[PDB]
Design goal:
By secondary structure, this protein is α+β, with helices and mostly antiparallel strands. Helices cover about 50% and strands about 10% of the residues. The protein contains 12 helices and 7 strands. The strands form 2 sheets. A 4-stranded antiparallel sheet has the order 2-1-4-7. A 3-stranded mixed sheet has the order 3-6-5, with no helix packed on it. Helix 5 (about 75-85) packs antiparallel against helix 6, helix 6 crosses helix 8 (about 125-140) and helix 6 packs across helix 10 (about 155-175). The termini are far apart. It binds magnesium ion. It binds one RNA strand through strand 3.
RNA sequence: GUAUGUCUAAAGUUAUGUGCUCUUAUUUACUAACAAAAUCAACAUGCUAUUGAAC
């Protein structure tokens, strides 16, 4: 089989491999099976964009700080930015939920009931803030497994989210960062998203911000349907399955995109 | 407007050196000189979007 390293985004890897001081030693690093040149150069471009890397290709202190999180660099960028923006408290649990697979359960015949249960937690802005409402309601039900099942959400995913939240909180308290809450000013989170995800943006026909390729909201999204259409979009992943799908979706204002990048 | 052309049957030698029986065109169908300037009669009474393996 082709090794994972030859076929995945590598920016977590390159961040860490710069964070330990393997330099242009990284640019010539002895792997068994070297990743494609354009994969390396693209991950370098991503890190340069995020400001983890300078124009020569050398690590910034922001890079070194981000590398102490167990994270792909965007998710560390957004947490560090959430300190200065003052939403660390919400950002912790949203970044925690964004790490986790298969958060909702959607069995063969029951697509309606699974979504109906999810839609009790709906935020009109995004999937991202709907994840917050899920974790808050889960906790308000004393983290109940039976509530998880009732609402078609995977408890394994939720317990892992809380374990990640407490770990990331520990990492922030190791970096001495304050865990400030934004409260109901959820736009602060959405401004932070622009700091991490400015490449991962799209606009209604959706159409990618930089490459211009046309793309689709995944049908699980709170923003999908025979229905909703917010003009400007930021997203957690782009993925081709049956279609070229944005995996989950958040609405944005264009002014934030040139504010953060 | 159903092209048209050539050939031959000649003369023998011109004197010397009835059954049977198919058929709702089951035809090998043949000719193109003829004409070509075709559009009234259209069209239903109201527009759509959907699903990922695993760590
Ligand atoms: Mg004539």
């Amino acid at each position: 089989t082709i090794p994972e390293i030859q076929r995945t985004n590598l920016s977590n890897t390159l961040l860490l491999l710069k964070s330990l001081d393997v330099t242009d030693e990284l640019s010539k690093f002895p792997f068994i099976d070297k990743p494609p040149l354009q994969t390396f150069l693209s991950s370098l471009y991503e890190l340069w964009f995020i400001g983890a890397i300078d124009t020569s290709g050398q690590l910034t202190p922001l890079g070194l700080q981000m590398a102490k999180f167990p994270l792909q660099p965007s998710l560390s960028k957004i947490l560090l930015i959430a300190v200065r923006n003052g939403c660390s408290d919400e950002m912790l649990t949203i970044v925690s939920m964004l790490s986790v697979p298969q958060v909702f359960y959607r069995p063969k015949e029951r697509q309606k009931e699974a979504d109906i249960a999810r839609n009790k937690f709906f935020i009109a802005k995004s999937d991202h803030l709907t994840l917050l409402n899920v974790f808050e309601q889960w906790r308000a039900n004393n983290f109940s497994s039976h509530w998880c099942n009732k609402h078609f959400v995977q408890y394994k995913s939720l317990v892992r989210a809380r374990d990640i939240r407490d770990q990331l909180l520990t990492i922030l308290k190791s970096q001495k960062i304050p865990v400030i809450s934004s409260g109901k000013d959820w736009d602060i989170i959405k401004k932070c998203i622009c700091s991490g995800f400015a490449h991962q943006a799209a606009k209604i026909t959706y159409v990618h911000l930089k490459t211009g390729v046309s793309v689709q909201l995944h049908p699980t999204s709170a923003l999908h349907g025979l229905g909703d259409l917010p003009p400007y979009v930021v997203y957690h992943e782009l993925l081709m399955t049956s279609k070229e799908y944005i995996c989950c979706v958040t609405s944005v204002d264009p002014f934030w995109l040139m504010e953060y990048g």
